[PDB]
Structure formats: structure tokens, C-alpha cells
Amino acid sequence: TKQAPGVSIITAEDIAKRPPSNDLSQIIRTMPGVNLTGNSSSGQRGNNRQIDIRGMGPENTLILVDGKPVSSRNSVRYGWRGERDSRGDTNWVPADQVERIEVIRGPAAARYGNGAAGGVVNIITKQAGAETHGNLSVYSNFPQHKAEGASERMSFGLNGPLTENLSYRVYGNIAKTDSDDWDINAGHESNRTGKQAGTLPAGREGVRNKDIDGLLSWRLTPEQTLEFEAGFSRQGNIYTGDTQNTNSNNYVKQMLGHETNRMYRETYSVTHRGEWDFGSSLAYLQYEKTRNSRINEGLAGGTEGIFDPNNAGFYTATLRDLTAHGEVNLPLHLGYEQTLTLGSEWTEQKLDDPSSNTQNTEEGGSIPGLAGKNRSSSSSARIFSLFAEDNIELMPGTMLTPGLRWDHHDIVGDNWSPSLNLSHALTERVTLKAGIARAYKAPNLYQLNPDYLLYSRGQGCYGQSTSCYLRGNDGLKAETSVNKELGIEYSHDGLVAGLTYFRNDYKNKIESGLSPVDHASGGKGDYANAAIYQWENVPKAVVEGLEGTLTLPLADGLKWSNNLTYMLQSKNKETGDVLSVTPRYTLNSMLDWQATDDLSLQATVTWYGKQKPKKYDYHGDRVTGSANDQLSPYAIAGLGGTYRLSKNLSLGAGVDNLFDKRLFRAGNAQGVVGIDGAGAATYNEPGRTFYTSLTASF
Ligand SMILES: [Fe+3]
């Protein structure tokens, strides 16, 4: 099946039956314990929501492609409120070239290491077979309302052998999601008066996609295979007015419909696979060069996250990420029938950002130890890891899996990650599963680097109205989370029913500081001698919720499937406020009717629960007025089908959001000078949308 306590699988047939518009987050989010949200409660960049697992934030959601990590979004500025102006790392592989997607959540994912506190998403691509095969896929949607941007997607795949010890696979994809119109949120915007009059919260950022990848599989011996593959990906956007604080200037209005940020992503990887008497072996090297070229942006209060016209033009943040890994596997026949995996892993993250370390100290005063101008554009860190997994069978069916992962981070230090996962067959139909593990999140190179500096004249400062600075902190402790999961599941004859309770105890979550650690000297007027905050380690935090699934075979050709997330609590224990805004529940329901041998119709409905914004503003004072707005529960229904016309060609068509339920971004969560708050109305929900698909394959 596709659901077990902690794990979920998405097949290629699953993707073809609920086709994404462009980004795979559309289909990944429908899994239990998975939401689409930002990394904090600011509402900033609210239309750029990424995959969140169990309310731990997208920053704790490790994206893999065939086991190799994706770190491209680390090349984007990590804002004061923990929000990069990034669309996530799920749009790198085209939808119709994915074989399957694995989603590992909670304690079963801590073994993967740094950034797996929420979970792990492994995007697995279709490989070459014993023959030569190829495919051609075309998706195109048509929203009822013209303001919402439409998506068009064309991809191909091609695979096969060349010699008798050499195989290959290539795929190319070209896709475009039109941006929402600039004025799509007009009339729904928050109250805007004074200098901020007319400023609109923006719709969904558009994107152009150029993806190219080719693979060479060389099986030199019976037991040994060596693979080379290279990837070239480009993502240019279509700007529609998005700024951090929903303010606007003239540089913005000039760039509407223009390309203000482009991500070149380059990936080369040498993979080796070996399998013999004693067991199996795997080791790879990957180099990921990300170039994040975008228009320069200010770094001070309201000018944070807006096109800075004093320094017009593009800069280029460059991210060289190097990951090498290797593991061997061992079946053991001892006092208990077990399996043993032994592996190591090394990563290097080089970050060149010529624009984030530029905020000077002429208005708040010089900071001792921090130069005012020409600070280094470079940040870097490395983690070396060793690990071992003991997959034990105590008695046939029942399984126990303790494991230890050790990481040495060249700035923060040592981390011991002890995982223990238990699966008990209480019956041939019922399985109880429990697990507890202490996951790992090393600070990102913006929270670390003490040359990274943001400034505010007071509005963003916690516990005052005077000007203040926020600064990096290279003494930070890593984020650690104890992820308790306990679940049970019944599985027999297509009938599956399961419920799981998770409670991740979130120790040392990095966030913007609360108490000032210093004060500067110098500056201008009322702003001089501004206080100094640094990125802290929030002592304790908690997330808690429920994961459920129920699949009933109504008839032989009919299947009713259900996935349920219910978020019980998400609390920053130090401040008390929420740490992430997710719906109270999410219930996805699909009815899969196999109408004929050569036809299949699908009906989908997704219930979203209530959504509550944050209690306290950037000051820490309880918000007032329209910043308390909540989003009411609502549902999105859809119909679709896939009409097979031959063993070579297939056609799909359907409608998303049958009832045209629409939501509009009104701004960020809280109010500021001139711009009232928007509360939970931080994103645009798309309306009724028709779509069609085409797949030719041999
Ligand atoms: Fe300000």
C-alpha cells in the first residue's frame, strides 16, 4: 500500500491521476502529516509556501532526488522572520519524469541527518529498463478567471542500453506557470493609508522551467555498477509585485511581468553500486552549483525584501554544495536475525552572497567586531557523519531498528542522533508501530555568519520602539527535536485503516532574538546607539498532531481513499505564540473508478480546517484589528479522468476546484505603519481550473 505509520509513497500512476500544474508540492502536500506553509508566522512571502512535515517548517524538510540532496534554496536570503523569497526545491524534477516519491516523516527520518527533523522527501526518477523506452508528456490548464496564471508543461524521457554493460537515461522538460495578475488581490487587500495607500499584496509568482538531465549506467562487473549523470535546470520567475512587507516603489511597477530572479542549478553526480556475497554497497559524489541571480534588495526594516533603487541591477549569490556518501549493508545470522548498515557522509556548503552583508552602521552606530563596509561575501560549513542501523527481527513479523548517527559540524560541533523504531505485527492484519528519535538541524549560513546584519528603526524590534540591529551568531547550538510517534494500522485485502499520533519536542529552535545582547555607539538622531539582537536558540517548543488514513474497496473497480492530518498544537514555549500557521486539519479524499479496461475516472475533495494567525507582532504586543482575521474551513473538489486510447497513447482531462472556492492574499499577518494586517489571509487560493494531459510512451 501507499501509507504506513510514518511513511507515504506516491506512484507515477498517482501523479498521472492527479497531475500537478508544475511544482510537485501540489501532490506531495496531500500526504498525511504534510502541509503547505511558510517557515514562520510573519506572512511574508505568503504565496511562496513549501512542503511542511508535521508542523516543523519547510526548513526541516529534506528534499532528495534519487537519494542526493537538494540545497539550492539555501542560496536565498534568510529573512528576519525566517522566510526566504524562494519557491522551494520541489520544482527541480518535472512531474511526468518521476517514477515515485517517498515521504518519510518523524523518527523514521532522523537517520537521514541534518534537516530531517520534520521529514524527508525523496523524488525518484524513472530509470532505464532492459530495453529502450521513451515518453512524451504534455499538460496544460485553463483557469476560469483570467487573473490567475495558467501552467503549460512539456517533458520527454528516453532510456535504454547501449552496450551490454552500459545503459542510459535522459529527460528534458520545459514548463511555464504564468504569474497571477498584479491586481488580482485588489479589493481584498488590507487597509492601506498614508504613504502605503494603494500598495497591493501580490498574487502567485510565476516561473519558467528549463530542466535537462542525462544518465549513464555502467555495470562493469556482475556485482558492480557505476553511474554518471548531469543536470542543468533554470527557473526564471515572472514578478507580480511581491515584497516582504507588501510595500511598493517605482522599481517594482517597472518589473511587473519581467524576470527579477533566476536560478541556474547544475548537478553532476558519480554513483557506484556493488552487491555480492556479504551484501550490498552504495557510494556517490554530487556537486551542486546554484546561481541565484536577482535584483538587489534593501536590508533595513520596511526596505527589507524590496527592490532597492539606490543600487539597481542584478547581483548573483552563488552556492557550491558538495555531497559525498557511502554505505554498505550486512545480513547477520546470530542470536537474533538482524541486518546491519554501515555508512559515512561528508558535505560542504560554500555560499557567496555579495548583497546580504552590506547593511552599514551609519544610522544605528558601529557594532564592535563588525566592519561597516566591505564585509566578506563568503560563508561556509561542513558536516562529516558516521552512522549504523541495526534492522532486527526478534520474531517473524516483528521488527526493531536502533541506530546511531554522529555528525561533526566544523563550527557548532558534535551531534549524537539516537533513533529507535519498532514495528509489531499484533495480527496478520494489524500492525502497531512506535518510534522515538532525536533529529538534527544545523544552523544555516545566514543565522551563523556574524557579518549578516539587518536593521530597523524600531518596528521590528522585540520589546521596544527604538532602532535596533539583528546579527548572526556563530556560537549557536544546533536544533534538536525528539520525535515521538505511536500508531496502529489495519491492512487486509485492499482495506487499510490507520491512525498515528506524533509529538515532536523541539529543543533549541533558532529564531530572531528577544533580549538585546549589546548596544552600538554612533548614528544619526533618534536612531543612534541602536540595540543589538542576535539569532538565539529558543529553549523549548512543541508540535503535536494526528495522522490518519482509510482506504475502502467499495467494489472491485472502485476505490475510496482518505488521508487525514490534524494539528493539535504548535507552540513556541518561550514566547507562547504559534511557530507555523497550518490548517487545523486537512482531509484529502479520492474516489478512483476504473470505469472500463481503457478508462478511469477520479473524484477528489480536500477539506481544509480553520487557520489562526500569530498572537504577537514583531514587538511582542498582542495584535489588534484585522490582524486577528482567521480563515474559515473550506473545501476544494475536483473531477478528472485518464482515457487510454492505446498501449502507446493516453489522454487525461479534468477540473480542479469544481465549486470555484477562492481565497485572496490581503497582506502579512500583522499591521504596520499604513498597512493594516491580514491575519491568516496570506495566500491566494486558485479558482476553478480546467486541464488536459497527453502521454505518448513506448
Ligand atoms: Fe521600520
XYZ file of C-alpha atoms and ligand atoms in Angstrom, residues 300-303 455-460 673, ligand 1:
12
model
C 16.539 47.571 6.754
C 13.040 47.445 8.255
C 10.457 48.237 5.594
C 13.071 48.272 2.839
C 18.407 46.865 10.903
C 15.136 48.505 11.896
C 14.119 51.906 13.226
C 12.086 50.121 15.900
C 9.051 48.499 14.294
C 10.700 45.088 14.041
C 2.590 51.923 9.577
Fe 10.746 50.426 10.041
